[PDB]
C-alpha cells in the first residue's frame, strides 16, 4: 500500500 512519511 502507499506509504508517505517525511
Amino acid at each position: 500500500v502507499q506509504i508517505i512519511n517525511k
Partner: antibody, heavy 119, light 116 residues
C-alpha cells in the same frame, strides 16, 4: 494567507553554486515540510526533494543527489536549496512548496526563482 | 516503477464538459494522486487530492465545477462549464516510499485549450 516568498532571479556563471531561499509566513513552519520542484523553460515539473524543518530529515530525487542540498532554519521560518557545480542543464525556475508529513499534496507554492547559468 | 501517464493534450469548447485522465502504473492501482493546474507564466496551483474510491478534497480557491473520480488505475479530473481561466497544463503527482526514501513523481502534463 499562507505564503512562501522565494529570493529573486539569479544570473550566474557555469561551475559556480547558487542558494535560493523560501521564507514561510502565516502558518506553523514545523507542522509541515518544504519540497522543491524544477521547471526547465519548455518542460514539465521535476521533483527535487523534501526537508522536514521540525526533524531536519531530507529525501532527494536520486537524479539530484550531489547537485541539490536542502537546509531549513526554524528560527527564521526559512528553507534553502544550494545548487552546486552549475551547468546549462541547471537553468530553470525553482519552486518551493508546502506539503504535510504524511500526504503528497503540495498545497501552497512559492512564486519561483529563475536561475540562469550563462556566460 | 511509480509512473503517471496523462490523457493526450485536449481542446474543449467554452461551457462544455472536460474529463482528463491520469493513469497509475498497474501495481500502484490503489494510490492517492494530486492534480495541479499551471496557467501561463504562473506557479503551479493545487487543485485536489483524489483517492482510489474517487473521493476528493479541493485546494484553496478551486471552484465547485472541478470534481474527481476513479476506475482501477485511472484517476479523472472533470471540469463542468469549462471557463477561459481553466486553460492551463494539468499535472498529476503521486507520492510513495521506495527503497526507504520518500519520492514524489509528476505526470508529463496535459495542455487544456478552451475553444470559442
Amino acid at each position: 494567507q499562507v505564503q512562501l516568498q522565494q529570493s529573486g532571479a539569479a544570473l550566474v556563471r557555469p561551475g559556480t553554486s547558487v542558494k535560493v531561499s523560501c521564507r514561510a509566513s502565516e502558518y506553523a513552519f514545523t507542522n509541515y515540510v518544504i519540497e522543491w520542484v524544477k521547471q526547465r523553460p519548455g518542460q514539465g515539473l521535476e521533483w527535487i526533494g523534501v526537508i522536514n524543518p521540525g526533524s531536519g530529515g531530507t529525501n532527494y530525487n536520486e537524479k539530484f543527489k550531489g547537485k541539490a542540498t536542502l537546509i531549513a532554519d526554524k528560527s527564521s521560518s526559512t528553507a534553502y536549496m544550494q545548487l552546486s557545480s552549475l551547468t546549462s542543464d541547471d537553468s530553470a525556475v525553482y519552486f518551493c512548496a508546502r506539503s504535510t508529513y504524511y500526504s503528497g499534496a503540495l498545497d501552497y507554492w512559492g512564486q519561483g526563482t529563475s536561475v540562469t547559468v550563462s556566460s | 516503477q511509480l509512473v503517471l501517464t496523462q490523457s493526450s493534450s485536449a481542446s474543449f469548447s467554452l461551457g462544455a464538459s472536460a474529463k482528463l485522465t491520469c493513469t497509475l502504473s498497474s501495481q500502484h492501482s490503489t494510490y492517492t494522486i494530486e492534480w495541479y493546474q499551471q496557467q501561463p507564466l504562473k506557479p503551479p496551483k493545487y487543485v485536489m487530492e483524489l483517492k482510489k474510491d474517487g473521493s476528493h478534497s479541493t485546494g484553496d480557491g478551486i471552484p465547485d465545477r472541478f470534481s474527481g473520480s476513479s476506475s482501477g488505475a485511472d484517476r479523472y479530473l472533470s471540469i463542468s462549464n469549462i471557463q477561459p481561466e481553466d486553460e492551463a497544463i494539468y499535472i498529476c503527482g503521486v507520492g510513495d516510499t521506495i527503497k526507504e526514501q520518500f519520492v514524489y513523481v509528476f505526470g508529463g502534463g496535459t495542455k487544456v485549450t478552451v475553444l470559442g
